C-alpha cells in the first residue's frame, strides 16, 4: 500500500507513465507540480519568479508530508527538483525514469561543464530511487518494468 | 559610470523600462536571464527543472562578477531572485520597480483561487528588494513616469 512515486528529469515521460500505471493498477494519479500550482494560484514558473525557489520548496516539502498521511496508494509524478528534499524517500517507493541525456535534450561534451551538472543530478535521482527504470524502450516497456518490481 | 541595474518581480515592467533607459541615455542594454539562457541553451524554467536552483544561482552569481568588469555603464535588467546574491548591490546602482500584489496578479492573468498565502509571502519578498535598492521607483503609474524618476535620480 505504498505510493508509487516517479522521479527524474522534466521530459523523461513521468506524467505519461504515471497515467498508465494508475490505469493498470486502478489507482488515483497525482502530480505534485499541479497540486502546488492549483493551491498557490500561480503557475510553477510564476511561483519561482514571484515567490522564489525557497517558497516553492516549502510548498513541496509540506505537500510530501501531507501525501504521506494518505494510506491508500496513489501514483505520484513529481517535478525535476523534488529530489533535493530529505523527506522524499519516505513518501513511498520511488522510481527513477532513466533516460539518456541526449534524448532528453532533444525532447553535452565530456570536456565542458554542463555534462558534469547533468551527471550529478542523475546521481541524486539514483540515490533517491528504490528502482531504476530503463526509459529507452518506451512507455509500455517502462510500465512493464515498474509492474514487475512491485509485483 | 555605474551600471543601472533594474530589480523587481516579473511583470513589473523591467524590460520595457530598460529599453527606454537605454534609448534615453544612449547606452547598451543587457538582460541577465537572457544571457544565462543563451549560454546554457535552456530556458530559465528549464534550468530550474533540469539542473536545479543551486546551479541556476551559480550561473547567475558568476555572471554578476563578469558584468562588474564592464567599465562602460550598461542598463541591466535582472531576474526575480537575483537579490539573494551578496554580490548584487555592487554590480551598480539598483532600482526597485515597486508594484503591489494586486497589480502583479492583474498583469499575470493575461478569482476562485485563494491568494492569501501567495500575498503574505510576496509582501515578505518585497523587503528583500527594498533592502537591495539604491532607489525605489513607483512602478504603479506608467512607463514614462518611471523613466522620469530614474533619470532624475541619476542626473
Author numbering:
A (entry chain A): 1 to 107, 119 to 162
B (entry chain B): 1 to 110, 118 to 162
Mind quoting what the paper says about this structure?
Here, we additionally determined structures of a dimeric HpSK·SO4 (R = 22.7%, Rfree = 26.0%), HpSK• S3P•ADP (R = 23.1%, Rfree = 27.7%), and R57A (R = 24.6%, Rfree = 27.3%). For the dimeric HpSK·SO4 structure, the LID region points upward, and a number of residues cannot be built into this region (residues 108–118 in subunit A, and 111–117 in subunit B), implying a disordered region. The LID region is most flexible and flips over the binding pocket, in an open or closed state. In the open form, HpSK (flexible LID) presents a wide-opening pocket, allowing entry of promising substrates.
